[PDB]
């Protein structure tokens, strides 16, 4: 994973400042082997150039280091090295889903942008997007829409960045959807959809279809949601990605919610299979909810599946699952359990901004 | 269910 | 009885707009209209500075500098241009905040903040001021994570020096109430308690008062009603609070906390007192809030509890509507009416969903 | 004179900081009357705009000044006001021929140039030229040629500044001439001469002709020097300018140095007349030297004329006059006085960089 | 016996030039050629820093970073580019100064100085260093007014702190000798005397020595021969001076001042001593200078005084040639030979004219 | 109930 | 004689 | 004679 080698470049940075030559040199070779893949990202390279520049000053070929902190270059190298360090520390914390710390790191790197000689504005767009996505993951929707919209306005200035500009409009879209601005979300997706089509980007078109499915699902237009979930499953790459678990899951959940329990069960079995394929405990608990709701109802085992979702702090999803169960049981004329799930849906809404992380 | 991106 | 300073800034911006449109009448009318109010306004260094800048650019366009002048582009033009632009955006932001359009306020504050960087030797408390203004604005629309981010950026600056102990303390007030609204009650308790020490050590009356009240809200939320009641009185001790509209909060909480324990006796004291502050300040919010207490605890009427609650929703106090309706929901459960307890729980949930929708437009 | 009103704008600046309202307001009116002439220079205007901006803050229409130093504008106005103050203080000291102080002021203003928002490089060229000319007047030729050459390279980028660019090449030219790089000076003048001709600027063409006269005079090509001095006198504006005293004087001095004493005397009488017309004691002493050398020789009165030139610290000129007299008297076979004037020419060379001013 | 550091900088710049021409051979030859000399050079932080920067840009062009690399333009490229450009111009300037091409040195120093502004957090003694280097260079070509301007700019900076007492004092040395060369003898006397106090107060040996010598030159120029003689010995007291080539100046002045008073006795002491230091350091200047003393005061020969003087003019020591020939001119006047006194006065004047022509090209 | 500041 | 400018 | 520094 590309966050992982960026993490190693930072361990090389740490071993150098601790003046330990040998540990620094393993990481330098480990990075040059993992860099020869030409596996994109010149930033990993540039950071590597800057670190070899200070590896040399500190250990290699220098008879007197006492004058190293007094060197003239130190000032310029420090700002770039610290910048990259902060940027990659942030990529790694994002990978671990510590979104508050990621934002902390991204923001330290973000200030250094003015001070660097020739950055032009697509580097500003990258931090706008990265910070915005982390804020989105912790459900800070207005600031998220603002940062990403800044990124899209930069990306929109160049035909060379149309894929990036489209990727930004997706994150705005899912933000409006999470906020419940469904009609704005729909408008936004279809305008993104037209020109993901113009350029024929398979992966963005697939996601817009899925998200349009979520939009009309939450609206209540079940058959129109069902159509869009299938359109996204058409794309062959999606079934082999872990991201496909969402759309397989929604297909199962949408069909059970209509009368179509037999095909619903088909997708359920397909969900359970990908869950084992990707070791995704979240989507096994989510499907166990479907199963113990619509085939072999056991309210206690629905509650244990929900309890597992709450231990993973997926509070936005627990709120909407639990509110749906609450609606089912009331329609079945059971009000004690419909009220108890409504209490659990409300408790979940209260957790959404409680943060989970240190903060 | 949160959207995919 | 001074005229709010954001309102005067709105006129200065309208005057500025008429100058670029070169409209002699509308400018002169705004010019006269502003010099009338400029001392009566809420003293602000920034308002005067903006006025002089617009006054000079007014002379350039219409007074001809007494009919003899050079074309408007010179060396100073550049410097004046960015000062005027800064002020225009700062006051566009202050006016939207005054009107409670927090999203639009944040857009303007963020444009102004960026232009501040370009002004030479702006000293660092001016940046702390924008961090705080943005953070409070996010808090008003319940974007707590960012709110804590900006407000602590301001607090990191004010804490760098002796002279901004009062400002740094105000920052802690907003960090604190965010934690309470985020529901991190235990962290919020420690946080307020540290602030109260520093507020006592320096003897700042209004910060001490507010920390007590906020400590009351925390334990109320925890369920520790008796301790919550202790702190609400502690805050009412402070003598200035009875005269500020912010005192409606404490009188109201006193009534609502006492009624929530059996003491319908003293609770009515505060209700009668609250209803008086309500129109004394023409605060429809707390008259609707107290009438809920009445039609809940005194000669009950659910049909009327629902409509005053409806008025709060029309005022988009979704955070407060959600917690009020949660209490009603639990009350009817304690009584054993579950159909209406479920009906108010459904209402409390719908309120939570409006908090996340943000009840204002976005670009 | 334009240095004089710039001086008044600075007295308005002084009265404001001393918080004396009335004295400030006379100078403001005195400047607005002397500014309504539309007598070029928007800088005098811009400085006036900036000073009225702080006149208003300080006395007019403000009920509370206690918050004036805390205002946000103060920082930006201070830099521009101080800049102009320093620039005009420098123009006034140049007018008074205190070239060391002028350079001091110009240089303080020069540093402020980076900090100002929209200056584009013709303002850098103006300080390059102004400082270079002051350094030239105190005989610092290399730095002078360097600063002005910087100005010309900026001015050469725009057809709109061809007159300025030519004015710069003149000052380079006279620098090379004073240095004695006569052949470079000649080449330089004729290249300037061609395109002063292309644009038909009367005043620069006149000066290049005069200076080409000085060049070939110092070379020894007397008849070619004589031709060029006459070409410059052709231009009618020159005889009415005080600058014409130089070329009338050189004509008289060149003709006496050839056999032509009758026409030489004609120009002498014309010199003495313009000397009285412009109250120019320097050129009366210079002509009294010619007279008491070539008509009615009196070595004592030549020495008193030279002594007056030395009291005005025109050491470059005293050195070359006295060296010429030294050469004449030796050719006349008198070595005691030729040696005594050579001693005086040498003493003068020693004074050239002694500075005269405080420094 | 270390190899001069400007010479190594010349190679670093030639190596840098071969890298832009992408010439593998010439770069590698310069690379080998420099690492041999880099410790043996006169330790310089700047030389090492430049070498590493060129070494890394060497790898990019030819070593392929071990045959796997990305195209040369990235984010660091910009920062490295301006550091390398700075160093190239600073060392182009140091090499021309070493070769005594003061005009070209000033051009490079001034380009480097401008690029220093663009480098982040350059601390202010680095600017004082360029002010001094330019000022000394102007002084070497006798542009005294500017020289005093730049050198005092450096001295204004070094004086801002405790730790640069030694540097600020070196600045006073150059301000002082400018005043002496400008002929402002009385100001120069006071100036040197103030410096000598500060040099004594801090006990800096070489500055004290030089101030004494320079005080000797001042009174020599004033005519106060006896006092000039006092100070020249005071400077020779200092024990380090006998071993530096700069000691040739003091031994020479001692010989020339004693001979100018009747004391042909002791004067010969210093002449014999001076001629020995002369080739001991292979200093043709002072062997020509002392032979002038000999063929003036010891078994005289004007034909030979004129040719050693001719060798000094061929070395473009026009300031010194002018003052030597002025002394000869006065000597023959004291004797009563005015034809040859006039002949040397004519020569001294022609020298003054070459000082102002600058004996080097200009763009 | 939101807090006071 | 210095030049004119 | 120029000075020493
Ligand atoms: Cl909607
Ligand atoms: Cl993907
Ligand atoms: Cl020549
Ligand atoms: Cl003129
Ligand atoms: Na907590
Ligand atoms: Na003097």
Residue numbers in the entry:
A (entry chain A), D (entry chain A): 9 to 367
B (entry chain B), F (entry chain D), G (entry chain B), H (entry chain D): 1 to 5
C (entry chain C), E (entry chain C): 6 to 368
What does the literature reporting this entry say, word for word?
A recently identified B. subtilis RRNPP member, RappLS20, is encoded by the Gram-positive B. subtilis conjugative plasmid pLS20. It lacks the conserved residues essential for phosphatase activity and has been shown to regulate the conjugation process. RappLS20 activates conjugation by acting as an antirepressor of RcopLS20 (22), which induces the formation of a DNA loop by binding to two closely located recognition sequences near the Pc, thereby inhibiting expression of the conjugation genes and plasmid transfer. The presence of the Phr*pLS20 peptide antagonizes the antirepressive action of RappLS20, reverting the system to its default state.
Crystals diffracting at 2.45 Å were obtained, and X-ray analyses revealed that the peptide-bound RappLS20 crystallized in a different space group with distinct cell parameters, consisting of four independent chains in the asymmetric unit. The electron density of the peptide was clearly observed in all chains. The peptide is oriented along the solenoid axis of the TPR domain, with its N-terminus bound in a closed pocket pointing towards the C-terminus of RappLS20. Recognition of the peptide by RappLS20 involves residues from helices H6, H8, H10, H12, H14 and H16. Phr*pLS20 adopts an extended conformation, with residues Q40 and K41 pointing in opposite directions with respect to the main chain, as do residues M43 and Y44. The superposition revealed that helices H6 and H7 (residues 129–166) of the TPR domain move inwards towards the center of the solenoid where the peptide binds, and upwards towards the C-terminus. We found that in the presence of the peptide, the NTDs move in a single direction and have a tendency to swing outward, away from the solenoid axis of the TPR. This movement can be observed to various degrees and was most pronounced for two of the four monomers (chains C and G) in the Phr*pLS20–RappLS20 structure, which each belong to the two different respective dimers. In the peptide-bound structure, two crystallographically independent tetramer configurations were found, which are formed through foot-2-foot interactions between two symmetry-related dimers. However, upon binding the signaling peptide, the NTDs shift outwards, facilitating the formation of the homotetramer, leading to a change of the interaction surface of the NTDs that is no longer available for interactions with RcopLS20.
